Design a protein around this ligand. Structure first.
Ligand SMILES: C[N+](C)(C)CCOP(=O)([O-])OP(=O)(O)OC[C@H]1O[C@@H](n2ccc(N)nc2=O)[C@H](O)[C@@H]1O
Ligand SMILES: C[N+](C)(C)CCOP(=O)([O-])OP(=O)(O)OC[C@H]1O[C@@H](n2ccc(N)nc2=O)[C@H](O)[C@@H]1O
Lengths: 480, 479
């Protein structure tokens, strides 16, 4: 009986696409896939892949059934810091004590049920964690209000609606709300979360119950930030993928993994399922030898060879040359297909705009859909990509020609601004897509308020053409 | 050495060798050489083999290089090898009574070009046809044939009229047709060969030799001796040999299809401008600088596809050839002096094509007036310049630094070239988001924004029709 039956998918994951497990999908189009990610912290991608593979290999080899331990978490973090200069500074492998860890949270990484769960965390009140509106200051956040100071728990539901509304008022992608983590008993809290996980997992019978326990605890580990940095990589890109692979599910390819603080466990199950679905889509697209185009990104032969030359992960090679003969791929595939089915009947057009490429399937999806349905903007709680976006915004960010063509035919309002004040045009300019932009402009110029639509300003007071004029520009002090 | 210029053929980077045959005008829109190869599979490999095999032949023979019909016939056989499109019309064999006709647009013509053309006695004598008309079931349907009862005294004014008429139809549109000679092509081919060999020994200077070279390559093109492959044979192959005999590099053309209706003097400039392209490709490659000429940036995929496609044993022989008893500095100094003529003609336009340094650009545009910055080059200049502003050219070339400077000097971005295209139309066609966004910001900061965006070219297309058409395949495909 295998320990991590899901390792099948880690091997099935194409070598030249392996970086997708660590690099947020949100970066792909704008940062040459993984290039922007590796450049901020050279070495990280090799370190993160080695961490995931070496530890997966540790648990698959042991006779004991997999149980969470702080030593394991500590090893994961040490492994994520190897060769990384940016992470050597804050000592990897060792825990935080009284060192402060603070960060800002925008509306786009939050939900009302998320904020309710967050304020309801007794270890946040007990540990003296801070949360509320303010500004970034000289020595950390300058809080106007701290919601954990004299928090009446009865008030939590209405306060969560107010905190969310306040966060939106500032801007979906703007940071007004700050979080200062616990500076006492982090070692006790890390052990208590570990204890809770190990105890609760044996309680869950269904796969969907196990997923809620898994995310519920990964969230508590993220919210408690036990290390100075590499908290995300350690818990969501590493730790999380092991119990997923223990259930025989693939690892998670995230668009925006930075939602484990202010999203609810139920909403995180969906976020994780969507991310498991991206691994399935990459693997299937690679099997059928179809160029992978997820999240509007088309890799170049130059990007692929550079990554292949940069790849150095001995434990990943061990997994790639590993035997899976006494493992049924069909049953494994059928289990994840059934697990993922929940994602099917939810925002059909939006998911269509992200995943659907066949014009016949697209034409059928958009048949008998009304004006409110085709112009629908998903509300708070759905995975971050959907929030405030129309099928048209999503079709533009995905490079979905066939969906955009169909939406134009169904007469979708291309002037609708998302929660960042951006139109389909703003995104076309940012992505650098000439065809999508030309297609929208033809529509815009065939209407009366053309000049008004072209001059629509987003949250940053920028026009689609400010973004177009800024497209491709380097991040270097260079003459040419 | 027989061909000192072979030095540059070797100095030409292997993965860029296709640039000698593929018109620069195609590069941006057709993935460099990809569109060219796909029209006649095998053709670039043949063209290269023809040029190298015959250059290697003349260098190896102790006799001084002299043009012969056998050589020309050999070039043509070589250009058709493994090429199915060229096998149909028998390579190496000369035309007799088989018709050869094509249309000529204003953009490939000049007044001095048309004057020289009508003045060609072998065109009148051989019964060649030229004038306005339409394409018909069995060839062009002529409304007028200028070679029928041509009074030579009328030629200068007729050339102005033919040109004006050609413009009236549209710069890139074909209204004027040419039906070549169908009698004594073999005599004319020999007479042109005889004339060349005799005239070349008469020219003392390099500039005199260049006029004799083009004058004859033009007559060979105008007489179309073969049914097919006349361009490759004469301008991409034949022409490069006497250039390499003078110690000059071979010619990298933007538009080589100007050897019918351009004058010999105007063709010297076209050829010099093409020789200068080879010099820029080589120098950029030497400095490990990515080559960006004519708005095209090759992808690693395009380079490796061409590297896997390349097969020319004579080219390899040239690449592994010795040039120790050849002074590269003297060779380089001779071409620099030869190309110096090109320096003070349309400074801003050339700047827009070649210049990339912002300091050089800023200096070039200093003390330049409104008429100078918005200047559209008239008929006679190499085809790329005709009717274009420095701004059109900056956009076609992907020259960000020049476009940035032109916007600062307040260049009119609404000016239409002779095809009815604005700087915006070209930005949409090239697919450049940054250039387009930059122009749109300027357009939207003016009153007639909506008018400028709705400017229709000759094809009745808007800049945005081209943007919407950008990247679209040439295949019956759903996805
Ligand atoms: C941002 N948080 C605080 C909400 C969660 C992450 O906690 P952290 O900052 O302690 O850790 P981390 O470095 O693992 O963060 C992971 C996230 O940082 C970003 N990241 C990480 C590494 C890197 N080379 N470049 C990046 O941009 C990505 O958005 C990634 O998803
Ligand atoms: C077109 N003319 C008649 C004005 C010039 C001579 O043309 P031709 O048909 O005798 O011969 P040719 O095939 O050698 O012409 C060369 C020109 O044809 C075009 N060409 C040729 C081969 C190819 N695979 N693709 C092309 O686009 C290019 O414009 C090239 O520069």
């Amino acid at each position: 009986m295998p320990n991590l039956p899901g390792l099948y998918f880690l091997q099935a994951y194409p070598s030249e696409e392996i970086w997708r497990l660590f690099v947020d999908g949100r970066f792909w189009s704008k940062e040459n896939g993984w290039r922007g990610y590796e450049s901020r912290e050279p070495g990280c991608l090799n370190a993160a892949l080695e961490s995931l593979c070496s530890i997966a290999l540790q648990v698959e080899k042991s006779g004991e059934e997999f149980e969470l331990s702080v030593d394991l978490i500590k090893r994961i973090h040490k492994k994520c810091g190897k060769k990384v200069e940016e992470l050597q500074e804050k000592n990897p492998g060792e825990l935080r004590t009284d060192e402060p860890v603070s960060f800002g949270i925008p509306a786009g990484r939050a939900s009302i049920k998320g904020i309710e769960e967050f304020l309801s965390l007794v270890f946040l009140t007990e540990g003296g964690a801070e949360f509320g509106p303010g500004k970034a200051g000289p020595f950390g956040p300058r809080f106007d209000k701290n919601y954990f100071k004299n928090l009446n728990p009865e008030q939590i539901p209405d306060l969560a609606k107010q905190i969310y509304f306040d966060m939106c008022k500032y801007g979906h992608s703007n940071t007004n709300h700050f979080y200062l983590a616990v500076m006492k008993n982090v070692d006790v809290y890390l052990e208590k979360i570990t204890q809770s996980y190990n105890k609760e997992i044996k309680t869950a019978e269904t796969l969907d119950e196990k997923l809620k326990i898994i995310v519920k605890h990964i969230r508590m580990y993220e919210v408690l930030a036990p290390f100075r940095d590499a908290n995300g990589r350690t818990f969501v890109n590493n730790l999380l993928n092991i119990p997923l692979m223990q259930q025989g599910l693939p690892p998670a390819t995230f668009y925006e993994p930075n939602v484990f603080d202010l999203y609810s466990a139920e909403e995180l199950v969906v976020v994780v399922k969507e991310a498991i679905f991206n691994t399935v889509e990459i693997i299937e697209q690679s099997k059928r030898k179809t160029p992978i185009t997820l999240y509007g990104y088309h890799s170049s032969l130059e990007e692929q060879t550079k990554f292949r030359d940069m790849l150095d992960s001995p434990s990943y090679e061990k997994i790639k040359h590993m035997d899976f003969s006494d493992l049924n791929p069909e049953k494994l595939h059928l289990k994840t297909q059934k697990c993922l089915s929940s994602l099917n009947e939810q925002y059909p057009l939006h998911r269509g705009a992200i995943y659907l490429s066949d014009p016949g399937e697209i034409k059928l999806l958009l048949s008998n859909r009304n004006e409110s349905q085709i112009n629908q903007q998903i509300e708070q709680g759905a995975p971050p990509i959907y929030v405030g976006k129309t099928p048209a915004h999503l079709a533009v960010i995905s490079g979905n020609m066939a969906m955009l063509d169909e939406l134009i035919a169904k007469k979708a309002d291309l002037s609708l601004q998302d929660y960042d004040g951006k139109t389909a045009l703003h995104y076309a300019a940012e992505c650098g897509n000439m065809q999508i932009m030309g297609k929208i402009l033809k529509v815009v110029l065939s209407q009366e308020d053309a000049i008004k639509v072209l001059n629509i300003k987003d949250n940053h007071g920028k026009t689609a053409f400010h973004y177009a004029a800024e497209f491709g520009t380097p991040e270097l002090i260079s003459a040419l």
